Design a protein around this ligand. Structure first.
Ligand SMILES: CC(=O)N[C@@H]1[C@@H](O)[C@H](O[C@@H]2O[C@H](CO)[C@H](O)[C@H](O[C@]3(C(=O)O)C[C@H](O)[C@@H](NC(C)=O)[C@H]([C@H](O)[C@H](O)CO)O3)[C@H]2O)[C@@H](CO)O[C@H]1O
Ligand SMILES: CC(=O)N[C@H]1[C@H]([C@H](O)[C@H](O)CO)O[C@@](O)(C(=O)O)C[C@@H]1O
Ligand SMILES: CC(=O)N[C@H]1[C@H]([C@H](O)[C@H](O)CO)O[C@@](O)(C(=O)O)C[C@@H]1O
Ligand SMILES: CC(=O)N[C@@H]1[C@@H](O)[C@H](O)[C@@H](CO)O[C@H]1O
Ligand SMILES: CC(=O)N[C@@H]1[C@@H](O)[C@H](O)[C@@H](CO)O[C@H]1O
Ligand SMILES: CC(=O)N[C@@H]1[C@@H](O)[C@H](O)[C@@H](CO)O[C@H]1O
Ligand SMILES: CC(=O)N[C@@H]1[C@@H](O)[C@H](O)[C@@H](CO)O[C@H]1O
Ligand SMILES: CC(=O)N[C@@H]1[C@@H](O)[C@H](O)[C@@H](CO)O[C@H]1O
Lengths: 172, 319, 319, 172, 319, 172
């Protein structure tokens, strides 16, 4: 997308991730783990369901219309009937083609932005206890077990607790 | 360990689906959904709506009362299905402004017939022909009435049928076109026949024409069909001196949601709110490429046969 | 203090307004403005355009010159208002292709009448009727002229009116339909009536019809109204031998910005550049749900009665 | 919002802020205060007024048209006159709905972006004199009276003046 | 030394072009491209499509077979160009629903003619006129045939022409209108003329009209042209007793991609897949403001004379 | 645009820079310089090429259409023929205006974004070796000649090499 996160500073996706659209991965004192982030995945799938509900919220009921096929050749008024229909189709064909183009473009944009939103959210929590490694990866400068990683996932990481150790590991 | 790596990512798949965008024509996403209904059931569902098969009868054949359309005398419909294998087995007739009458009947959605007593003085009723048998004996369009002279003379008839009812009456009438000059003086006595229907808001005078037409099941003559609508309070009036095809009564018009459709599609039991000439289609996708002719709660037709809608992010797998 | 906190943020409001987007069907924003003009004034405005009230006169009754429409003899308009409470108080008439004449007169937007002295030889002019009383005594349409036999014989008429003007002349004419066979030979002598208006580019021939029509204020007959446009350089020519409803003169056509509208609204002093059957509406908004019939600098009609356009950020108040 | 500022990392707006759209709330030695920014407020109101001028006051002038209401039933050509008018009303109605949708979805995005731009604008000023607390809030690590805030508001805060004080408070 | 200063940015241009956006009315970008085709070549190209120069002939004059349109007897086209400097140099004629006939011939896209030997018993063929000189001597429309009485009487003509072909036959015929009463009995004996062309499906009965018309190259008469299509298997039958303008044969109708256009443009050698009344235009753009009348692979007409599609970022030059 | 890089936090463009759409301007030990970035340029050019090819893909091949110009005045059916062509043109006109409005508003945004992306991609490389002066300018705190700046363009700057030097010059 336009935010350059998906197919960008995050080089590629994860076929291993099967339980969410956006998640984490890590390595620490208690091995190496993967963990989806639901709130972002829920923000993504709500908007797509919104689009799909908006596109699929109405089909106009229509009854007695003009004749759209003929057997003989009549002349003047028969042309107008074919023309009115031919014009109607072209305009809806355009309206359908543009809608697809705009919507799909917005889909790849809002999915991308949500990938980036999560990154800035995770950064903001870490404060001065981690530096951006690039590739969509952080480097936390203290021992961060699964209990520690879990607080980040659930939006409850206190930087003050690990500030001194990390701040000392960064500059020595 | 004194450090910890914490990467972020997004999911990917092995068989992504391509879509169009403002910039990219064929960009691959995780998952997309169809918006153009391409396939059909192959038959018209007749539960969502009351669908009536016309069979061998056209909507105008049944209206007039063609011998092989006796089933459709009081029957009504939501969607009338005209067939390609349909015929007109009665007197050779034509209609100036045919489709207009076909529309009015199809839109009304009913062929219920309330008859009325007209005072046909000095003429004989129930005229028939050999090209319109009702079992075997000669007959005629059941809702029309062929009048001819009584004995020695054809009197200049003149009837009034007032509309005391509170709706639009639709009277069907016509004029006969003999094959030869003898026939005009044989059947109708008077030399120059004529028919003049006239309401308070309009007039419709017609003149017949004596001449040979092609051989239509024996008959070399014709009958031009006409129609006259009468509003509440307005009176009906006819004024003829020959060649009058008398009206038996009137059909009940009504602003319904009915229509007519040409199709050779099978009509079997199912449920579907959109009917085409190819059979019913589901109305969940917004567009369709089955047919431009439609009836019911239908998707809007377009020329494209497929338009995928991304329902997921861009897909980028591992190398 | 050796520190300070700095928190950024945005404003909010208690009573927000909901709007529709690409994703959300209902999302709350700080502000919004209406794009659909759903309400109306309840009266037509008259300072922007010259709105002319027809009153009990229709456009064609005033055109022909009905006794009760002597007010609209030379007047012109931008928008003519045809009332539902309107009648025809002259000779009983009809018009084939009635809407075409009504449309051409409306687009013309004027009813000025330049009379012309036709050379009528062997016929009496200024025929009248009891069903078209002008004040008290018998009369007829002021722009038409009933011609009948002058004494013993009705000659075959033959006038010519060359167009030396540089615009399209509109001659309104017609043909009479007697009630009985005695009345044909009584008023017009000749047995068979006929009328033949013919320019260089075209020809219109009409035949009358002797028969009884419904009782319309005494008369059981009819007059079919026709018209013939004559371009610069072309010449007019009639060829009749009875039943000729002659033209007194010609109306002056013009390609203007005028029209006609059916309405039962009040036309009181105000200013607005958009008129409907309901009245006038302000054209600041780009859409409207008042009425599909519009005239002037108007917003387009749509099925929606409200569309809230966002004029501010998303609203999210305190706890 | 697609940038994740409004209804995002900023918890909610302020009903008390009645002197602008975006703004600063601060605590310092001289107390606590509030003030609305005029520049970022102006930008958002310019883009909205830009849209509102495009859509408004281009109503077309139409005079004589076809009849759209009929007393008698005429069949063939009357159905066409209704059908053309029916086709016109549907297509314009769609367009109206699509316009309103795209405008509103863009209206939330540009108002969201502006908030986010004002944030990064402030970070840029503060250099290494302030850390990102969270909730779109900044911890300034030196004494910052109303003059120090007034300078930040007007975009004339000089980080070198307060660096040695702040940089020491952040790392000790 | 132990510092650097890396700054980032974008390019700029001296002459940025202006464009329209959702927010800003006039905003300057580094580059753009035109989507509305405003200009034209000035001449119609005729390598892509087969453009046929109609010359002083109209489509219907060439159809009938006018003396000066003998070049278009068997020729065919993809697009036909009627010139405003076109004339009819034969008998004075009019056509009710002229445009329908015009359109049918245009859509057909050909004027090949298969003649058929009708059985004209008791009448004289090849009826000519001084107002239609084929070189010098008197003549008539080549595809039509003016019949008159043979000696002392005029028999009630009767001929049939079955369609054993597998396409729609187009018979062009008409009826004559004598100038005076003596002339009806002179040329056609029978007092009351009449023509009745009829298929198995429909009928067309016409009556002539004796009266003077304006002077058209030495004639005060008219000929009302009609046409009748006959389907595979269906049979043609004419039944007249005077004033019959008989057909020599039929034209071959085809469902083609041909049309007609009123233009006064020059038609020279070049290649361009779109055609307008002002010549050919390039179809690389999606829109155009040249002319609403189009033919071939053309862009869509719009009211605007320009629309600039930005193809570069926002320009912001140095100071 | 919406991201606030072009005509936002960056003061203005560079007419000197002719060989690309985006790039750097530096000052170091071997004098000053300018270099246009090829990757980010190429990206933005592809998206705008993509737009062109979509809008300039098809033009529909029409043949026999209704009569749109007339000599005589007929009445009923001639008005309908005018009204269809009048309504047809009005709808396409609006379709053309809206398209060019959306496209260009999107064009300024994706081009603005590609500035903001390149700026960030460069911040992420430097790590803690450089601060953010303002106006899209980084202050690098170590000796970086044209070879080092060369590694910053291509995307191969190893901050570890210069870290100790840069962390010394920032905080002493
Ligand atoms: C070649 C030959 O010898 N032929 C005659 C043949 O013409 C004729 O048959 C009758 O012809 C008359 C027309 O003069 C009718 O067409 C007869 O048709 C009937 C019918 O439909 O059965 C009889 C019926 O009673 C008639 N009904 C009325 C109300 O008139 C109708 C009607 O007249 C016409 O058909 C309408 O045009 O026709 C047809 O049998 C016979 C008997 O004269 O003699 C042959 O020799
Ligand atoms: C001009 C003329 O002849 N007017 C006469 C008419 C006509 O006979 C009928 O209107 C034709 O149908 O009838 C009466 C009437 O209307 O009062 C007497 C009047 O003298
Ligand atoms: C067949 C024939 O002889 N036609 C003659 C006609 C007809 O008398 C009128 O056209 C009928 O109205 O008149 C003239 C003419 O047209 O030049 C001379 C011509 O010889
Ligand atoms: C096979 C597959 O990919 N299925 C998914 C599923 O989530 C859903 O049925 C559809 C509609 O959005 O999208 C797709
Ligand atoms: C000759 C004749 O009978 N004329 C009458 C007419 O007077 C009457 O008004 C009408 C109503 O039924 O019927 C007819
Ligand atoms: C009372 C009030 O707050 N009104 C708002 C204001 O923003 C403006 O007057 C209008 C037009 O944008 O929208 C609404
Ligand atoms: C240097 C450059 O790209 N110039 C372009 C040219 O390619 C084209 O004429 C158009 C965009 O397609 O505008 C300008
Ligand atoms: C079209 C053509 O080839 N020739 C003639 C030309 O000789 C004549 O001068 C002109 C007069 O209108 O009509 C055309």
């Amino acid at each position: 997308g336009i935010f350059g996160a998906i197919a960008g500073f995050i080089e590629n996706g994860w076929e291993g991730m099967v339980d969410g659209w956006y998640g984490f991965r890590y390595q620490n004192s208690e091995g190496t783990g993967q963990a989806a982030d639901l709130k972002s995945t829920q923000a993504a799938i709500d908007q797509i369901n919104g689009k799909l509900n908006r596109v699929i919220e109405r089909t106009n009921e229509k009854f007695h219309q003009i004749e759209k096929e003929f057997s003989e050749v009549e002349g003047r008024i028969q042309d107008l009937e074919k023309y009115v229909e031919d014009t109607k189709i072209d305009l809806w064909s355009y309206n359908a083609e543009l809608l697809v183009a705009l919507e799909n473009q917005h889909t790849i944009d809002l999915t991308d932005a949500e990938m980036n939103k999560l990154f800035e959210k995770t950064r903001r929590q870490l404060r001065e206890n981690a530096e951006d490694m690039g590739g969509g990866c952080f480097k936390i400068y203290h021992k961060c077990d699964n209990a520690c990683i879990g607080s980040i996932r659930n939006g409850t990481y206190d930087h003050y607790i690990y500030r001194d150790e990390a701040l000392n590991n960064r500059f020595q | 360990n004194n450090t910890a790596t914490l990467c972020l990512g997004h999911h990917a798949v092995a068989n992504g689906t391509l879509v169009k965008t403002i910039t990219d024509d064929q960009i691959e996403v995780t998952n997309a959904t169809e918006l153009v209904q391409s396939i059909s059931i192959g038959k018209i569902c007749n539960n969502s709506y009351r669908v009536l098969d016309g069979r061998n009868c056209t909507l105008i054949d049944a209206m007039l009362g063609d011998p092989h359309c006796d089933d459709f005398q009081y029957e009504n419909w939501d969607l009338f299905i005209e067939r390609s294998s349909a015929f007109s087995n009665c007197y050779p007739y034509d209609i100036p402004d045919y489709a207009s009458l076909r529309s009015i009947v199809a839109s009304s959605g009913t062929l219920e017939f309330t008859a009325e007593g007209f005072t046909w003085t000095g003429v004989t009723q129930n005229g028939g022909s050999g090209a319109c048998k009702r079992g075997s004996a000669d007959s005629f369009f059941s809702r029309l009435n062929w009048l001819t002279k009584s004995g020695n003379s054809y009197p200049i008839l003149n009837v009034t049928m007032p509309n005391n009812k509170n709706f639009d009456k639709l009277y069907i009438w016509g004029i006969h076109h003999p094959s030869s000059n003898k026939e005009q003086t044989k059947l109708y006595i008077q030399e120059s026949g004529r028919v003049t229907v006239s309401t308070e808001r309009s007039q419709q005078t017609v003149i017949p024409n004596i001449g040979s037409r092609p051989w239509v099941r024996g008959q070399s003559g014709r009958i031009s069909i006409y129609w006259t609508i009468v509003k509440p309070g307005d009176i009906l009036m006819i004024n003829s001196n020959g060649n009058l095809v008398a009206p038996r009564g009137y059909f009940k018009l009504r602003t319904g949601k009915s229509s007519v459709m040409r199709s050779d599609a099978l009509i079997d039991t199912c449920v579907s709110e959109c009917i085409t000439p190819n059979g019913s289609i589901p109305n969940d996708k917004p567009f369709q490429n089955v047919n431009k002719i439609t009836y019911g709660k239908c998707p809007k037709y377009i020329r494209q046969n497929t338009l995928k809608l991304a329902t997921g992010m861009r897909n980028v797998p591992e190398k």
